[PDB]
């Protein structure tokens, strides 16, 4: 989440259409901006995993932090033996936190930048 659902689509359209080779390809190649696409292969496989210490779960066990390559960060647990379950998605929550602070961490650290930049 980088902006309103309409404004982000307007910005993507702008940069894809950009006549400058540099801006257009910088946008079109960085999969962070294009996490799923037409001919692009999905990046839902896992980038990284990091176990907690023991004792973190609702049971005695340790939790699993799991980061997909499309930047979905989740915490997973195996509460019954069979099925791992997603306890939370931290990429969702952080996007909301940032959006409600206009992506400024310190309240006057800069002007609100134009997302069309």
């Amino acid at each position: 989440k980088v902006g309103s659902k309409t404004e982000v689509a307007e910005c993507k359209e702008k940069f894809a259409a950009s006549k400058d080779p540099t801006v257009s390809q910088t946008f079109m190649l960085d999969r962070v901006f294009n996490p799923e696409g037409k001919a692009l292969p999905p990046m839902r496989g896992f980038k990284y995993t990091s176990w907690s210490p023991m004792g973190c779960d609702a049971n005695g066990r340790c939790l699993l932090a799991a980061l997909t390559m499309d930047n979905r960060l989740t915490i997973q647990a195996n509460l019954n033996r069979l099925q791992w379950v997603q306890l939370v998605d931290l990429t969702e929550i952080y996007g909301e936190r940032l959006y409600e602070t206009s992506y400024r961490l310190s309240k006057n650290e800069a002007p609100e930048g134009n997302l069309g930049d």
Binding site: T26, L29, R31, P41
Partner: protein, 579 residues
């Protein structure tokens, strides 16, 4: 859209991307090339030891005279003479069409143009490697480390006043004890300086800065002096094929500062300089499937060591395993140097984010890719292929979007044989490609921002530049004693009436219906093609192959008033800046 016919006879909508590419390339170079880099690495004459004739003889390629050949030029009378030329010698340029053939003594397996800053109007040169023996063929799985020679050939300034009666001159060569050379790449910009630069007698004005990929598995970096500086420094009585033994600027190899355990990587099979100022990184593709990068200015005692001879050894700052097989070709993205494309003999084209090497941006599986080209303005890559896995007649040259736009691959040119080599002219937005069939073609890409499926017919965008034909008249000697090469050259003056002219019909009969040739050497085969990277001479093309002949062509029909004006603008600016 745009309508009508261009003055060269192509439709305006076919030419419009070509004209557009001129401005885009000029603006890119203004932003992201430079006029000087690597000021530390100026050539020193005391490191250029001239080998005597009897010392040089082990390095010289072994064929002393070319195959016999004749050149037919479309619309001229038949000359009918067979030409033959000595090793390190050249025919005179055709007085009207300015093409030149010259002979390098062996089959050419690497070739690049020396880059010159736009507007410099300089003398133009090519560096090339021709294998010692016509009959040698080297297994990829094994290091070689034999003796060989790197050749520098001077083409002149290639102005219209200079081209009639021009000849290529072998200006010097370097004796290389590092096996055969599989790739040559000059530093894209900032290596050249004016030949008249005042430097004290040990220091020679730099022509360029050149990376050699060795079958010995190491990369050698040479800073090249201008020829006039050596010849004035050399004693005048010396033998004229000046073969030097030269200490490198640096040797680039895979390892660590105390790991003697020899690298798995094997042969070094591909190079790519970082396309943008300050060009500080150089990448190489290896037989084991790794891509390796060296940070050439590095001071760090973990990457730079100085050998007792004073040259550097550089160990890489990063490597990653790109392919399951030999990395036969690299291209580095000009528009943003975080991205690189590499193709392997596992016949996947992989696009990489060099910030995130653990997963390619995109893999597209294809036929067995021999060479890539990544033209500046287009998001996708153009792929030459080996035909061994394509369906019969569906092999050829393809353009392949990197994937955001989502277009299907564009079949730009059907080919029967494997295209050994390909190059894209950023100035023209065109590719040229060379075939085991010994045909050289060029093709003009559509504006690849717009969906290629609406390209009504690709054939109107491509034409032949020449085909070599063996005429009877397997070992090399068993061929040359019994055959001569008939080079058939097209009239590149314009593309008027193109598809009704004889060379297009010959090419279209080649497409589909013609058949592979085996049980002979393939002395006909072309192995390298390079469009000129320089704005001066931007319309020139060089190619060569198994014949050890090398041919220089001018595609007069794509050289056009916008580029001629842009040359003159850049000429005036350069003369105003450097004097």
């Amino acid at each position: 859209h745009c309508r009508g016919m261009a003055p060269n006879g192509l439709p305006n909508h076919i030419m419009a991307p070509v004209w557009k590419c001129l401005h885009l390339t000029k603006d890119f170079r203004e932003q992201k090339h430079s006029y000087w880099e690597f000021a530390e690495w100026i050539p020193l004459a005391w490191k250029w030891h001239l080998l005597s004739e009897l010392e040089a003889a082990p390095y010289l390629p072994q064929e002393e005279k070319s195959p016999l050949f004749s050149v037919q030029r479309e619309g001229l009378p038949e000359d009918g003479t067979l030409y033959r030329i000595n090793r390190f010698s050249s025919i005179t340029a055709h007085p009207e069409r300015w093409d030149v053939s010259f002979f390098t003594g062996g089959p050419l397996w690497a070739l690049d143009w020396c880059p010159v800053p736009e507007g410099a109007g300089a003398s133009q040169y090519v560096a090339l490697f021709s294998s010692p023996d016509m009959n040698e063929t080297h297994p990829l799985s094994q290091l070689h480390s034999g003796p060989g020679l790197l050749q520098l050939w001077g083409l002149g300034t290639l102005q219209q006043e200079s081209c009639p009666g021009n000849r290529a001159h072998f200006v010097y060569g370097i004796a290389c004890d590092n096996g055969c050379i599989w790739d040559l790449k000059f530093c894209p910009s900032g290596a050249w300086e004016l030949p008249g630069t005042p430097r004290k007698a040990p220091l020679l004005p730099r022509l360029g800065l050149l990376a050699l990929a060795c079958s010995d598995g190491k990369v050698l970096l040479f800073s090249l002096p201008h020829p006039e500086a050596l010849l004035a420094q050399q004693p005048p009585d010396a033998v004229k094929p000046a073969i030097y033994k030269v200490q490198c600027v640096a040797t680039l190899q895979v390892g660590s500062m105390q790991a003697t355990d020899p690298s798995e990587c094997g042969q070094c099979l591909s190079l790519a300089w970082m396309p943008t100022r300050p060009h500080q990184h150089l990448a190489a593709g290896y037989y084991n499937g790794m891509v390796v990068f060296w940070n050439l200015p590095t001071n760090s005692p973990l990457q730079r060591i100085r050998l007792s001879d004073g040259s550097l050894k550089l160990y890489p700052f990063q490597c990653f395993l790109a392919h399951d097989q030999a990395v036969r070709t690299l291209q580095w993205c000009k528009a943003n140097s975080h991205f690189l494309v590499s193709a392997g003999s596992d016949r996947k084209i992989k696009f990489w984010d060099l910030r995130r090497p653990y997963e390619p941006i995109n893999s597209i599986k294809r036929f067995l890719s021999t060479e890539l080209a990544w033209l500046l303005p287009y998001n996708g890559v153009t792929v030459a292929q080996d035909n061994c896995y394509a369906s019969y007649g569906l092999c050829g040259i393809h353009y392949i979007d990197a994937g955001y736009l989502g277009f299907k691959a564009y079949f730009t040119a059907p080919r029967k044989g494997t295209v050994w080599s390909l190059s894209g002219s950023d100035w023209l937005g065109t590719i040229a490609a060379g075939d085991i069939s010994g045909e050289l073609i060029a093709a003009i890409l559509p504006d690849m921002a717009l969906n290629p499926i609406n390209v009504k017919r690709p054939v109107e965008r491509r034409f032949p530049i020449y085909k070599a034909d063996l005429i009877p008249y397997r070992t090399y000697t068993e061929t040359v004693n019994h055959h001569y090469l008939l080079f058939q050259d097209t009239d590149l003056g314009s593309f008027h009436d193109l598809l009704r002219r004889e060379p297009m019909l010959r090419m279209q009969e080649g497409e589909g219906h013609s058949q592979l040739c085996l049980d002979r050497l393939q002395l006909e085969a072309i192995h390298k093609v390079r469009f000129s990277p320089n704005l001066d001479s931007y319309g020139w093309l060089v190619s060569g192959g198994q014949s050890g002949l090398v041919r220089i062509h001018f595609v007069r029909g794509l050289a056009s008033p916008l580029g001629h004006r842009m040359q003159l603008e850049s000429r005036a600016h350069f003369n105003a800046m450097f004097q």
